[PDB]
Amino acid sequence: ALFHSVKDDIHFDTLLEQAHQVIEKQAEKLWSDTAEHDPGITFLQGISYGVSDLAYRHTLPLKDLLTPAPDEQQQEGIFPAEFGPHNTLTCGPVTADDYRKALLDLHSSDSLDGTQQDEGDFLFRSVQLVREPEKQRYTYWYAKEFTLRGNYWLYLEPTRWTQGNIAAATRQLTEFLTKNRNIGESVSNIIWLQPVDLPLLLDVELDDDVGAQDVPGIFAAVYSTAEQYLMPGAQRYRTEVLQNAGMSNDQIFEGPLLEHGWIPELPAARDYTQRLTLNLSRLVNSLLEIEGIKHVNRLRLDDSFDKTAIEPVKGDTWSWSIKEGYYPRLWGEDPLNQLAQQNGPLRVIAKGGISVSVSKEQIQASLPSQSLIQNEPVILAYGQHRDVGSYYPVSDTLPPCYGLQHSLSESEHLLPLHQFMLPFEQLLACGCQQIAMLPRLLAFQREGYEVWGDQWPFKSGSVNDDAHQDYAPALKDLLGQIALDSDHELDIINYLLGYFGTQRAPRTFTTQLDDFRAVQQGYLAQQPTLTYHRSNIRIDQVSSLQKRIAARMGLGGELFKPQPDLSQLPFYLIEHRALLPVKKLFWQNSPVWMEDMGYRLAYASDQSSLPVQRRLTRTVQTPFPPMVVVGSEITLLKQVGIVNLKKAESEKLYAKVVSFNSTLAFPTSEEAWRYSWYFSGEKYERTDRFSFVISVVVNSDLIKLPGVDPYKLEEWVKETILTEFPAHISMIIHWMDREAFLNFANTYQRWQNNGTPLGDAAYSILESLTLGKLPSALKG
Amino acid sequence: ELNELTNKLSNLVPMTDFKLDNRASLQLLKYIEAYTKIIPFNSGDKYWNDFFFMSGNTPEKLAKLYQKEIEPNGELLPQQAFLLAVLRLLETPISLLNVLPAAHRELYYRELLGLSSHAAQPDQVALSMELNSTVMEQLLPEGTLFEAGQDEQGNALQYALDASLLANRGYISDLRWLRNDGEKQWVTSAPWDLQAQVSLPSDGIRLFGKTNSDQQVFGGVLITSMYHLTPFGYSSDIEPLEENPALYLGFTDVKPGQTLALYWKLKSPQQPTVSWYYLDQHNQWAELDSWVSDGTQNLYQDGTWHVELPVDASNQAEQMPVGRYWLRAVVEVPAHEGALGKAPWLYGLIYNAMTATLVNVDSISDSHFLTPLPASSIQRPVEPIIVLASVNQPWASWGGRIPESYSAFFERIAQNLSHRNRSLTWGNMVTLLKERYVSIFDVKYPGNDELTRVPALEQQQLTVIPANRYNDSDDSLRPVLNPARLQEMADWLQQKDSPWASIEVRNPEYLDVKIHYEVIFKPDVNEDFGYRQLQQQLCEVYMPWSIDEQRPVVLNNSINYFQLLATIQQQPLVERVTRLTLHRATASVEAKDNEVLILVWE
Amino acid sequence: LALYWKLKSPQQPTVSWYYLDQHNQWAELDSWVSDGTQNLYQDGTWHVELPVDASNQAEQM
């Protein structure tokens, strides 16, 4: 509704009074007749109506300006469906609390196969994820004791449905944990729980004025409030129910994306590290609540707790403590097994003593039946597309005695007039393009150099085109100066990124400004899915913080393409935690893994050069300290054992190192690659490297540019991406030449196409770092 | 740019800084010059750009006439004044086009994303309410209104009490303590005495401090082995003297049926767990803690607490003055070194007091919420209660915030879409501490070299540096929090972070970098006045947290040698410096990690 | 404290200013003085913040 406030202002009568005041101040002496007759005002009245036409198109409602023409649409409306509140407000599952929000969601109809899509509760009534016990935390030798930091266990309390089919819930959760696997953590051990039937004698006394037909309503009610207290069940309900409530839209979409319901309150599940007390003194008012119930007479158990030694805690009759692994199942196969049979697990007393009962199926009709609800993505639908793009010439609206719609060059005064209207036509034709460019100018999925506009104002059949047909090829080409104004497009991406709190990248010197910009463009389009998955190293897709690192540096790459194509990348993010395995009678025999560290002898570097190098090797470890104390030249013959303790810190790749400890002396110069490397043990720097350490392999051709000072550049490179990394997550980088990068670039993609196996593709990557690998099985 | 429309247009839409068209009027005429030089003026080598810019008129001059940098002369060529009249018309489609990206953003947040803006926050105020001498008791309910004056361009400001106190005649006559500084000698301070008419002095007294009004207890300089002489009078039987500083309050003109309600104004470094005792007729102190319902969190923060004065509490008693009722308060101060481990600061204490919150928050204009309301302002209620003598506020109007402007509402939602209320990265830990906590001046990350050496360091240590508004340790240049609320910032951020991330916040140790500079001044100034004045602005820029009421400005750990030397040169009284002599405890000194530089001048 | 001196001085005397203390020793005040009277040459205003630890009770005065 911008039109009703500006309506007095975008008007012919008020724009003309603006235009006369420019003439009356500046040309009052040379142009003193401004009456309605002269050709000067009629040209102005043609233009000031065209501006009033042009300014009217701005006051259309914003839903109709921003919708594109129906021939070209991205699928859902004005903002793309990735930019809805379901993906822009929700963040990833990182906490143990929203791990619980995500694991509680999983449901039998979400399974891709089986059980005819109608049966099933949610897969888990409660879960508890916690860090694993400290005594067994993937401790490993091969040297001395090294414990893995950062892998947890989860305890699964399954429901009544999934204890019928354990194997169906196992394949669905193992699919889910890879999609939600975080940056340095993984599941090691999954714990399933075992039921204990908790018999629960409770003697209900009923009210005086209940109906006889309301008693199946009672049995369903006393069951339901008994379940939700003993069994902590998460409550889910629709979004629009929360919109009826007082809490805002920021509070609804807080956790991870939940396809089924929203869980704003958690059931506060107790930990499964220790045994768990169940206090039932709170139960009685939850039981006193219902209409026909006036009081309860008993609350006890009939010796069905001794099978797992449930002990009543110190003095109170109501509490019981179930032993380590189990969870309560209070009435297994509930109505037909217990409640209907008139054995009395629950004795209803009505009108003194009449003590009526019910069958199984009668209370299920009065039972509240839940509804399975699915939450569709939120979008803004399109408005009506309005034809703001079409331009009608100002030379049409002039009186026909000026001859602009006359036959061409019949009189000689036609052509100098028809070139005078041309500059004031192209200024108005730029205004009609830029309103039609507004779905293109403000889309989040930008793809173009092209800004304000260069289209010719006249249609090709028109008489106005025929006048300037001699220089229409020259005028269109200077209209292609708009590509020179493409720096302005980088100032809108800085504005559009500012919706999500981040500025654009600074412009560098090694841009390749064509390839720099598409990295800056794809950063905007995929921006909500980048912050939603800040730590999602999914086994096939490109890492979603590898994108977010490269954009903040700004350096070019095809990693913002719609498909990743992991052969050719700028850099690669590998995790050492991904390289560690956990796992006809005695033929398996897993003897050792990761044999010992080592390199291969081509040339030595101690002082940090530009690569801080040797091909098919690494100078990757950062020692100042003691010597490399072995060599393995000729093991095809005798003279074994005598391997030499070499010099402490020497850098030898060329003859500028002309200076020469040494014993058992060596042969050592330039000829035999058959020597190997080692480290002396008296440095004593054996550290834990595999816990939380991401390694980023970088090209050294960025340092190859002159004037670099690689140390001074490295102070800037870790300056920006410091914010991009997590605080616990740790980064060492190793940069090599073009050829050793391309040998890595092949081995990473075959590693990722297989799905991260622990085979020969991973051990080659383990050789490419310092950490050393067992390559002895594939010797040649 | 068209001031007739753009006043009406800027008031409706937020109109942010970014424009879709930065096309200036000088920039437009160069575009129309390259256009017209293609169009051929017929049968001639000269083109149409010679027509539109004819006689001594360049597009830089025509932009000067249009923007009125030159006064408009009466004679301009008519095809040029036709051209300048067109650019006056084309300001109207351009100005409606620049206003649209401000409306595209607001459509995105409110219509699709559903986000709302924060309303105004009412502020509450400490209010002490004394009675007349004519009645003893007077009751006033929840929702009675006090006021002072009126807001500008709007309604009057009303304040309403949240809880219905009943007032009684009486006051805090006496406040005295015993503190145990040394073995076998204890001192007896009397800061507040109404019977000698001496007041609570100097706006705040360090509890258990060196008042110099103390007298040593000569009955207890040697412990008793007189009628059993103890402090403040004779005791009936043996009473212990434990190693705990304790303060005694002297109440007057209160009957044992009545209740007492205090508002304490406190800045305490660490909270002392307190227990409260009252006099009896047997001269034995009894426990009062069942009757106390305190909101001051055992004298941690400022807060109101009301106590019904217990039955059989006696005006006449031994071992204490006989005229006044007495309450005892045992302070368990936690053991810690420095001025951090000392007692609360006690800005003041008022009797018969209860807080009062703002009534109607929507009617009041934004000018009132900018500042706290001034002290001693509300002096009367709205409805005239005749038996009331006076109300007063000694301190005034903490809390309460502005209704959100469209500039600050956009910055708030730009933060929620960046980190999404999970502290996963280093940057997200820096802002998420800074928005919630007002005590934080800044947080600085742990450096560049630290994150790259990393032989599996799980523990990360954010170094927070607070403002001078909220610091517990008595050092202006070195502000420290108490470790209990410092640990509570980690416990807030542990939920947002990964469970494997063991994150805790600390105060950084302060390195002192000294400078010894010589500097020649103006010809007509004394240098000692010139040294001292130059030192204050040098203390301000490189320690911005030290000067009170400063916005948090982001500042690096590094101080540059030359940017220091230039900052000395921009003072108005300096002329020339000779040398600096940077002296870390001559080049630029860069701060090592977990360390913050403080300059020292001797 | 802020004084306005009304002066007709023949020649300007270079003045130094001292204040009392609790130790009964005079200390220098000239760092605190910002005078526009040009060391009592002309009429002019000068304002002095009275220095800290200046004592009402003192000997010799």
Which position has the token pair 């720097």? A685
Contact B13, B4 (CB under 8 A): no
Q: Which two tokens stand for residue C20?
A: 């009392």
Q: What residues pair up with B461 in beta bridges, in sequence order?
A: B504
Contact B86, B48 (CB under 8 A): no
Give strand ranges (E) for A75-216: 124-130, 139-140, 146-147, 152-158, 187-192, 194-196, 201-206
* Distance from C-alpha of B83 to C-alpha of B25, rounded to nearest angstrom: 12
**Interface B-C: count of C-beta contacts within 8 A:** 10
Terminal alpha carbon distance of chain A: 76
Question: Per 3-state DSSP, what percentage of chain B is helix, strand, and coil (rounded to 5)?
Answer: 20, 25, 55
Instruction: Classify residue A635 by its DSSP letter.
Output: T
Which position has the token pair 């009939």? A302
- Is A718–B452 a contact, with Cβ atoms under 8 angstroms apart? yes
Contact A776, A595 (CB under 8 A): yes
Give the type of residue at B306: H
Q: How far is B528 from chain C (nearest CA, A)?
A: 5
With CA atoms as reference, the chain B residue closest to C28 would be B528
CA atoms within 13 A of residue B211's CA, in its CB half-sphere? 24
Tell me the chain C residues in contact with residue B528 when contact means C-beta distances shorter than 8 Å.
30-31
CA atoms within 13 A of residue A703's CA, in its CB half-sphere? 20
* Distance from C-alpha of A606 to C-alpha of A624, rounded to nearest angstrom: 8
Edge-to-edge strand ranges of the sheet holding B158-161 = B124-125, B356-358, B158-161, B145-147, B380-381
> For C5-34, b where at least 16 C-beta lie within 10 A, e where not — what string?
eeeeeeeeeeeeeebbeeeeeeeeeebbbe
Count of residues in chain A? 780
User: After which residues, if any, is chain B broken (C to N > 2.5 Å)?
Assistant: 225, 585
Q: Which two tokens stand for residue A276?
A: 């768990």
Tell me the chain B residues in contact with residue A434 when contact means C-beta distances shorter than 8 Å.
20-21, 97
Residue A278, H or E segment:
strand A276-278
* Distance from C-alpha of A69 to C-alpha of B49, rounded to nearest angstrom: 38
Start-end of H helices in A152-268: 166-179, 215-230, 239-244, 249-252
* Distance from C-alpha of B537 to C-alpha of B546, rounded to nearest angstrom: 11
CA distances (Å), origin A710, targets A606, A713, B573: 17, 5, 43
Contact B108, A62 (CB under 8 A): no
Give just the sign of the alpha carbon dihedral B462, B468, B472, B477. Answer: positive
Which position has the token pair 């888990």? A124
Residue B329, H or E segment:
strand B325-332
User: Cα angle vertex B599, ends B517, B548, to 5°?
Assistant: 125
Tell me the chain A residues in contact with residue B457 when contact means C-beta distances shorter than 8 Å.
730
Contact A29, B74 (CB under 8 A): yes
Closest CA to A436 of A420, A454, A421: A454
* Distance from C-alpha of B527 to C-alpha of B534, rounded to nearest angstrom: 10
Instruction: Classify residue B125 by its DSSP letter.
Output: E
Edge-to-edge strand ranges of the sheet holding A201-206 = A293-300, A201-206, A346-349
* Distance from C-alpha of A729 to C-alpha of A726, rounded to nearest angstrom: 5
Give the type of residue at A723: T
Helices then strands, each counted (H, E), chain C:
0, 5
* Distance from C-alpha of A116 to C-alpha of A135, rounded to nearest angstrom: 44
- Number of other residues whose CB lies within 10 A of the CB of residue C52: 6
User: Which of C12, C15, C29, C31 to mutate to test binding with chain B, by most B CBs within 10 Å of its CB?
Assistant: C31
User: Cα angle vertex B330, ends B327, B333, to 5°?
Assistant: 145
Q: Which two tokens stand for residue B33?
A: 């010059």
Closest CA to A86 of A375, A372, A373: A375
Q: Do chains C and B touch (3 or more CB pairs under 8 A)?
A: yes
User: Cα angle vertex A624, ends A623, A627, to 5°?
Assistant: 85
Environment class of B207 (CB within 10 Å of its CB; exposed 0-12, middle 13-18, buried 19+): buried
- Number of other residues whose CB lies within 10 A of the CB of residue A190: 13
Q: Which two tokens stand for residue A741?
A: 């990068």
Helices then strands, each counted (H, E), chain B:
14, 30
Q: How far is B66 from chain A (nearest CA, A)?
A: 9
Coil/strand/helix, residue A531? helix
Contact B482, B269 (CB under 8 A): yes
> For B230-251, b where at least 16 C-beta lie within 10 A, e where not — what string?
bbeeebeeeeeeeeebbbbbbb
Terminal alpha carbon distance of chain C: 20
CA distances (Å), origin B515, targets A284, A294, B559, B600: 74, 83, 12, 7
Q: What is the 3 state secondary structure string of A329-386?
A: CCCCCHHHHHHCCCCCCEEEECCCCCCCCCCHHHHHHCCCCCCCCCCCCCCCCCCCCC
* Distance from C-alpha of B538 to C-alpha of B534, rounded to nearest angstrom: 6
Give the type of residue at A778: L
Contact C58, C14 (CB under 8 A): no
CA distances (Å), origin A81, targets A61, A84, A476, B413: 21, 6, 38, 19
Tell me the chain B residues in contact with residue A88 when contact means C-beta distances shorter than 8 Å.
113, 417
Q: What are phi and psi of A738, to 5 degrees?
A: -70, -35
Spatial neighbors of A660 by CB under 8 A, at least 6 apart, are none
* Distance from C-alpha of A619 to C-alpha of A614, rounded to nearest angstrom: 7
Coil/strand/helix, residue A742? helix
Which residue from B88, B93, B501 is facing A431, i.e. has the nearest CB?
B93
Give the type of residue at B280: D
Q: How far is A139 from chain B (nearest CA, A)?
A: 15
Give just the sign of the alpha carbon dihedral A649, A655, A660, A664. Answer: positive
- Is C30–B532 a contact, with Cβ atoms under 8 angstroms apart? no
Contact A321, A309 (CB under 8 A): no
Which position has the token pair 């850099």? A571
Closest CA to A196 of A320, A327, A93, A90: A327
Coil/strand/helix, residue A306? coil
With CA atoms as reference, the chain A residue closest to B76 would be A27
The helix-helix angle for B78-89 and A39-56 (nearest 10°) equals: 20
Q: Which two tokens stand for residue A637?
A: 């013959």
Q: How far is B482 from chain A (nearest CA, A)?
A: 24
Residue B496, H or E segment:
helix B483-496
* Distance from C-alpha of A514 to C-alpha of A691, rounded to nearest angstrom: 39
Q: How far does Cα B27 stand from its chain's mean position?
A: 47
* Distance from C-alpha of B353 to C-alpha of B167, rounded to nearest angstrom: 9
Start-end of H helices in B348-471: 366-370, 406-416, 426-436, 450-453
Q: Which two tokens stand for residue A185?
A: 């953590």
Which residue from A25, A149, A428 is facing B72, i.e. has the nearest CB?
A25
Contact B269, B342 (CB under 8 A): yes
Tell me the chain B residues in contact with residue A488 when contact means C-beta distances shorter than 8 Å.
22
CA distances (Å), origin A382, targets A65, A76, A249, A367, B242: 10, 8, 22, 43, 78
Method by which the model was determined: cryo-EM
Contact B97, A57 (CB under 8 A): no
* Distance from C-alpha of A320 to C-alpha of A199, rounded to nearest angstrom: 12
Give just the sign of the alpha carbon dihedral A244, A245, A248, A250. Answer: negative
Tell me the chain C residues in contact with residue B530 when contact means C-beta distances shorter than 8 Å.
none
> For A149-163, b where at least 16 C-beta lie within 10 A, e where not — what string?
bbbbbbbbbbbebbe
Terminal alpha carbon distance of chain B: 56
Coil/strand/helix, residue B360? coil
Instruction: Classify residue B5 by its DSSP letter.
Output: T
Give strand ranges (E) for A611-699: 693-699
What DSSP assignment string belongs to A44-70? HHHHHHHHHHHHHGGGS-HHHHSS--T
- Is B526–C31 a contact, with Cβ atoms under 8 angstroms apart? yes
Edge-to-edge strand ranges of the sheet holding A730-736 = A572-575, A693-699, A730-736
Closest CA to A501 of B105, B497, B489, B13: B105
Coil/strand/helix, residue B282? coil
Tell me the chain B residues in contact with residue A468 when contact means C-beta distances shorter than 8 Å.
39
Coil/strand/helix, residue A757? coil
Q: How far does Cα A104 stand from its chain's mean position?
A: 20
Q: What are phi and psi of A300, to 5 degrees?
A: -155, 180
Coil/strand/helix, residue A209? coil
CA distances (Å), origin A18, targets A6, A15, A118, B97: 15, 5, 71, 19
* Distance from C-alpha of B119 to C-alpha of B402, rounded to nearest angstrom: 8
Rg of the Cα atoms in chain C:
13
Q: Which two tokens stand for residue A101?
A: 């929000």
Which position has the token pair 């050719």? A568
- Is B48–A722 a contact, with Cβ atoms under 8 angstroms apart? no
* Distance from C-alpha of A300 to C-alpha of A544, rounded to nearest angstrom: 55
- Number of other residues whose CB lies within 10 A of the CB of residue A196: 20
Which residue from A30, A78, A94 is facing B75, i.e. has the nearest CB?
A30
Tell me the chain A residues in contact with residue B41 when contact means C-beta distances shorter than 8 Å.
416, 419
Q: How far is C34 from chain B (nearest CA, A)?
A: 9
CA distances (Å), origin B64, targets B24, B25, B71, B78: 12, 9, 9, 17
Q: Which two tokens stand for residue A694?
A: 């991401």
CA distances (Å), origin B289, targets A665, B274, B560: 84, 9, 58
Which partners does chain C have (≥3 C-beta pairs < 8 Å)? B
Give the type of residue at A462: S
Give just the sign of the alpha carbon dihedral A410, A414, A416, A420. Answer: negative
Contact A168, A527 (CB under 8 A): no
User: Cα angle vertex A537, ends A532, A538, to 5°?
Assistant: 95
- Is C34–B532 a contact, with Cβ atoms under 8 angstroms apart? no
Q: What are phi and psi of B286, to 5 degrees?
A: -115, 165
Q: How far does Cα C15 stand from its chain's mean position?
A: 9
- Is B88–A85 a contact, with Cβ atoms under 8 angstroms apart? no
User: Which of B522, B525, B526 to mutate to test binding with chain C, by most C CBs within 10 Å of its CB?
Assistant: B526
* Distance from C-alpha of B563 to C-alpha of B555, rounded to nearest angstrom: 13
* Distance from C-alpha of B184 to C-alpha of A19, rounded to nearest angstrom: 97
Residues of chain C whose C-beta is under 8 A from some C-beta in B?
30-34
Q: Do chains C and A touch (3 or more CB pairs under 8 A)?
A: no
Closest CA to A522 of A551, A499, A501, A500: A551
Give just the sign of the alpha carbon dihedral A305, A306, A307, A312. Answer: positive
Instruction: Classify residue A81 by its DSSP letter.
Output: G
- Is C32–B526 a contact, with Cβ atoms under 8 angstroms apart? no
Tell me the chain B residues in contact with residue C30 when contact means C-beta distances shorter than 8 Å.
526, 528-529
* Distance from C-alpha of A174 to C-alpha of B455, rounded to nearest angstrom: 32
- Is A431–B90 a contact, with Cβ atoms under 8 angstroms apart? yes
The helix-helix angle for B426-436 and B483-496 (nearest 10°) equals: 130
Which partners does chain A have (≥3 C-beta pairs < 8 Å)? B
Spatial neighbors of A697 by CB under 8 A, at least 6 apart, are A571, A572, A574, A733, A734, A735, A736, A741, A744, A768
- Number of other residues whose CB lies within 10 A of the CB of residue A756: 18
What DSSP assignment string belongs to B216-232? E-TTSSS-----SEETT
Q: What are phi and psi of B118, to 5 degrees?
A: -75, 140
Which position has the token pair 């009896």? B280
Contact A629, A644 (CB under 8 A): yes
Coil/strand/helix, residue A139? strand
Give the type of residue at A48: S
* Distance from C-alpha of C32 to C-alpha of C54, rounded to nearest angstrom: 13
Residue B81, H or E segment:
helix B78-89
Q: How far does Cα A498 stand from its chain's mean position?
A: 18
Closest CA to B205 of B317, B349, B63: B349
Which partners does chain B have (≥3 C-beta pairs < 8 Å)? A, C
Q: Which two tokens stand for residue C30?
A: 């000239």
